[PDB]
Amino acid sequence: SGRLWSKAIFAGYKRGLRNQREHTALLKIEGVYARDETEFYLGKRCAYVYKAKNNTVTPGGKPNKTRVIWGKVTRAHGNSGMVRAKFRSNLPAKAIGHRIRVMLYPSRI
Amino acid sequence: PHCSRNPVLVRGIGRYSRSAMYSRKAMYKRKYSAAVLATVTKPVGGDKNGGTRVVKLRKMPRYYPTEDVPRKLLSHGKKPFSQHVRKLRASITPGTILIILTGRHRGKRVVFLKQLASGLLLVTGPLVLNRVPLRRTHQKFVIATSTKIDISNVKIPKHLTDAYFKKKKLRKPRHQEGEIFDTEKEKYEITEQRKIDQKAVDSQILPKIKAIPQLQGYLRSVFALTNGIYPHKLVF
Amino acid sequence: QVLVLDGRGHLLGRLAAIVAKQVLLGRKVVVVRCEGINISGNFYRNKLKYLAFLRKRMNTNPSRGPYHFRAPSRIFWRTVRGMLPHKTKRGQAALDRLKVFDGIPPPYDKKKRMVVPAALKVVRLKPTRKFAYLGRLAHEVGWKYQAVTATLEEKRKEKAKIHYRKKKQLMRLRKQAEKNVEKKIDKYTEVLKTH
Amino acid sequence: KKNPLKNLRIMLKLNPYAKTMRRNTILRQARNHKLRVDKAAAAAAALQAKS
RNA sequence: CCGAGUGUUACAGCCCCCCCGGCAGCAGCACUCGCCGAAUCCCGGGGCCGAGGGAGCGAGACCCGUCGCCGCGCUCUCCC
RNA sequence: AGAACUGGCGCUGCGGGAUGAACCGAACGCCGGGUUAAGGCGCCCGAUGCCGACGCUCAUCAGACCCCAGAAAAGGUGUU
RNA sequence: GGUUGGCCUCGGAUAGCCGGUCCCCGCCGGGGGUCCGGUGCGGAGUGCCCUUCGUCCUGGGAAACGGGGCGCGGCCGGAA
Description:
Chain A is mostly beta strands. Chain A has strands at 6-15, 20-29, 46-51, 66-69, 71-77, 82-87, 99-102.
């Protein structure tokens, strides 16, 4: 019981001005607003929880209608401290603005 | 045998050079110029017969496969898992209150005891503050907390090791009949010996906690980020 | 959930630069009392470039075409309409999360409004240079509802002053009620640790 | 091409003096660290023994 | 009279500047000298991405090349 | 309209100049990581959400970045 | 699609804020001395729920409003 993940929305794709590169997203986690203080979040394992029609889940519990796309923080981005991240899929581009879930794994400190 | 007789200071660089090592060993007065079985016969056990039979064992193959992939290329020494190294973070010492993150427990504050010969580390909240038994957890899936307690002479039991924490099951069926393995319908009762191993290490963690007042409520609680709770604005 | 921006003292574009980014991230921002929005430059200049804005009009019929909104809620709303990519569906649904309200509604008058110190007339302009209200340049052009908008504010600022009197009436006790010496210990733990 | 200057015994395969160039200078910057803790303490605990 | 503030001419009875003989122990340091740096330099720790591809001059080799060059440690002598 | 020296479009995409044959970068197998060029960094739009530095500037027709997209003489007790 | 909610002064910026006897508002508050605090601690960089694991034996502090709610019934309160 209790949330064990820092909040984070999905902000866009790693783009130039015309073309975008789909292979790495970039985020905006809630709370960092400077590059100098995002060093905690490098390497943390982040996940995109969403809903769909069948079931397919992993633990001992029976499958229900949730499925996920895992991923990890690659590096920092910009002076204002947002974070780009490379999932093991590409984001569906529907998730623009809706949150992802940055966990507490990869915890060095 | 002897010890190294060369202290290291950088990994792979000794402190004494090539000429001074020749004096420390004193190799000048120990320089030197000095200096199959396959099997045997079985008995005969035979009449109208002679000759105890052939030296023959580990014979030829009856059957070669059609093709073979060529042999590997040796690449380097790339030693297996029970031979590498053990490493912990510097902020985990015996008695450091940890935080579970990946488990079924998921946040329960526990007490670190000992990092075994596997990289994983045996760690328990005591059984009467949490419902955490003497489980192993991993290094990188737990957050260490800067509050500590001194269990420097806790006298930790010998026979609990990696081998005491393994999981087992054995296959009788390879055949489509209406059992799902026919032994998975069974709660496990190895617990009738782990209990005796618990209160032989649980019973001396409780008086070590009750020196500091607030702590037996602190292990009772669970860790949770809610609203003003920001890590990197949080000294753990 | 929802953030409720107050609108007085703010500049127009400096606010809507911030609002248009916080709405493309998925929040719901509600701009409240957009009537009292300052705008830069003297009043007669801002009136001209909104009077000369009114002639932007397609010549063959104006029923199709440039929809000059006049109320100062839909003045600010058209500004965010410029600074959003509203032709995509990514921008159509960035106007589903903005509802700038003229005056203060009853859903939001018993909320606590927020202010942004990146768009304030206090912080941003040098104090010797003239400004203009979105109040009386929107009334001067078309928006015929200035009287009945300020009339409802004094009914809001009547039931607010009696609330602010009665919250401090409630608050006057918990400094004097805290006076008892009975609860001494639970303040060792907080004067030491950020009371 | 494994990088020289970043792993050892590839410098040494190409430059054998580079190891004894290294443990001649780690000594003169570990003994000079002791010469800046001892001399430092002999002027940090010096006037701390005055007053 | 005390205390503050104006306007004074006035060279020490707050101070500063330039000289002529001195010590402490001096750090490019009490984050302004942040200089330019390194055969005058090395050590440690994170993060990301990848893992591409029958080597036995020797024992007539035998489940099965941890092997080549390189830098190493110990013994085939002793005391402690 | 016509010539001289070099380069380019013509045969050529790509990042930039809002769009563009020739301009500034840079010339192309299929891609993973890294870094930059001309350019930029309030919002469209990746990036100043730096506690940036020192000034100039009120426009009832402000100004805003090569080629490049609307201007001169003369004048102002505007103001530096 | 989401992993707790803030139930509200007005406004000032070369200043505003809190606490306050007296006179003026149908027995409470508009108007002045007086007392505080001010890079805002009567601090949405804060605040209160709160991270309450459940439950028992069993002591101390705190506690005379009990608190879930089909309640049962009255009331007046809030028009943008």
